[PDB]
Write a protein that binds this ligand. Structure first.
Ligand SMILES: NC(=O)c1ccc[n+]([C@@H]2O[C@H](COP(=O)([O-])OP(=O)(O)OC[C@H]3O[C@@H](n4cnc5c(N)ncnc54)[C@H](O)[C@@H]3O)[C@@H](O)[C@H]2O)c1
Lengths: 258, 258
């Protein structure tokens, strides 16, 4: 009963399996009428994406290494050879050495910090500025963040300044592109069940904690995020740019457990 | 007649001349009793620092390039050959390419971003880890930041996500080290007429705008920042850690001019 993206086409980055946030988003954005292009980071991923993409009417798949600006130049070159125009971009790329997401933050190595910054923060700047060039009549973009950027989440470590800066760049990008009628927002998702446990050593704990202590008593679903993304990428969110939108079943509001 | 820093020893990072924030801080800390060590970046800065440091009774000056791990190691070796233990650190170091502090944030290049991040953000993590080893009974450190991290200031560009990451790591460092009674805080200063300040285009306009529209209608002085540093580094702020403390004559609270 929703087709507000009828006739709109966009780019989805961040799919790694059927449990990826970018995938939940993809499903919901397609059900609302969007044509999807996808990027993929590796071969195993491409092989899982292929069937997934097919179930949302799409064979448009383009490998990309978000750490290499040439790769991204190429990603847009391949996109452009089918679409002269783009309406939205989903950026859900998060990487860090998972072995360094344990113990105290001060053990963050310089190279992991550089790499985590590059992939988890600056890639959005890169992509956004490439994509804008295909939005001559405006458009909308989102990145993904987590509340661990601003309050201390144990183990999160290197991810934390990276998101913090991602959130910062989100707001600067919004100001840059605002005159061109491009909107740039972020979704601060809560832990997603099962996904949490594979991303970081205490993921299960973080999630269980979040579900026990959120006002809504559940964790956010992939579909929740998909619908919030649908909101921020459609005309519905026309009065909204540069927003760090919290979609965590309200976990962020509670100061302590009951 | 203050002397709450009687018998304390501290590291001052970031003096470049007699207008530097770290210098204002050094002056008020010294006048409250503290013995001071200084790190300087280059030879001209060193030549300018010798006479100054002399006026606060110090010849304890060590070179240090903060994008060089070896050099920060050497810095702390040179400290230890005189002091086995240390009471406080001031981290007042920033860098970004003058050329990129102009125009839209999206023109920020990858290399300037990595470098700005290393020097402006991660160098604090670097320094904090080494210094902590010199505070077996606890102590206090501060870094410097600016409200441009979280609200958009024209031309501030790459400095913004860098400061944001810096504010993030401050809180994370505060959690890693609170068990050791080491407090880690930051000062968010209003505009001050400095050497690195003149890298930003239209910083003059920025400072005039911030002065005109602040509740107090004045700019912060090196002494204001020095005094808030004295607070943040002594027994006075014993209940304060992880705090981003605004010392900007209240600019941040005003939503629009009157
Ligand atoms: N200038 C302002 O108005 C202002 C506003 C609030 C916050 N801040 C912050 O204050 C601090 C900057 O000092 P400042 O503004 O008094 O100007 P400044 O230029 O006098 O001092 C900046 C220092 O950063 C140092 N630095 C740069 N690269 C270095 C390296 N590789 N190794 C060691 N040192 C290096 C410089 O040597 C210099 O001493 C920064 O954290 C800055 O972001 C500045």
């Amino acid at each position: 009963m929703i087709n507000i993206l009828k006739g709109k086409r966009g780019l989805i980055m961040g799919v790694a399996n059927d449990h990826s946030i970018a995938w939940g988003i993809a499903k919901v954005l397609h059900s609302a009428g969007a044509q999807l292009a996808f990027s993929y980071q590796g071969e195993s991923i491409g092989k899982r994406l292929k069937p997934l993409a097919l179930t949302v009417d799409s064979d448009f798949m383009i490998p990309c290494n978000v750490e290499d600006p040439s790769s991204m130049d190429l990603l847009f070159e391949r996109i452009k050879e089918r679409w002269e125009t783009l309406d939205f971009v989903v950026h859900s790329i998060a990487f860090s050495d998972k072995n360094e997401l344990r113990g105290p933050y001060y053990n963050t190595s310089r190279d992991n910090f550089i790499q985590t910054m590059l992939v988890s923060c600056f890639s959005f700047t890169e992509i956004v500025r490439r994509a804008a060039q295909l939005m001559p009549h405006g458009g909308a973009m989102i990145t993904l963040t987590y509340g661990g950027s601003m309050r201390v989440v144990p183990n999160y470590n290197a991810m934390a300044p990276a998101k913090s800066a991602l959130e910062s760049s989100t707001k600067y990008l919004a100001c840059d592109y605002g005159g061109m009628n491009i909107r740039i927002n972020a979704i601060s998702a809560g832990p997603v069940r099962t996904l949490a446990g594979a991303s970081i050593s205490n993921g299960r704990d973080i999630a269980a904690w979040s579900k026990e202590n959120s006002p809504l008593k559940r964790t956010v679903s992939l579909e929740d995020i998909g619908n919030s993304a649908l909101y921020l990428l459609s005309y519905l969110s026309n009065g909204v740019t540069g927003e760090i939108h919290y979609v965590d079943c309200g976990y962020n509001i509670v100061a302590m457990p009951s």
